[PDB]
Amino acid sequence: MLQPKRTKFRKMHKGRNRGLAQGTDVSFGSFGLKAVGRGRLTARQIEAARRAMTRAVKRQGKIWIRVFPDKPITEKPLAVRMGKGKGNVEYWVALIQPGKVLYEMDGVPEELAREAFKLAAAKLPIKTTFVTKTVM
């Protein structure tokens, strides 16, 4: 469960996920999974994708997670009324913008990398695409 070890403040404003992403290139490895849409990725969703992706390649090569869940999401307890302060932190999410590379991979064949990213994508609520490194 990826989560900041410590933070300056524990609760954060909801905010707005707008704009295109930064970190849109495959820098760490040969192949990568790139989000085509915008949304929120929970630590659990990222962990499930990593488990499914690492299982496929049979623990070969290297896996880079380019996204960190640094946003604290607060949910009010069930059956409580509005007000009475902000809700307690329940989980952590990473804001995703179209173009972001969520995961990177190296040391495995391209046709094998395609399948591993397909099994990971299924556990993800955001439309994703398969990308490879390019020389700029």
Binding site: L20, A21, T24, K34, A35, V36, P98, G99, T129, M136
Partner: peptide
């Protein structure tokens, strides 16, 4: 020198 690609 440099190339700008569409994000997605």
């Amino acid at each position: 020198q440099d190339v700008q690609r569409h994000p997605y």
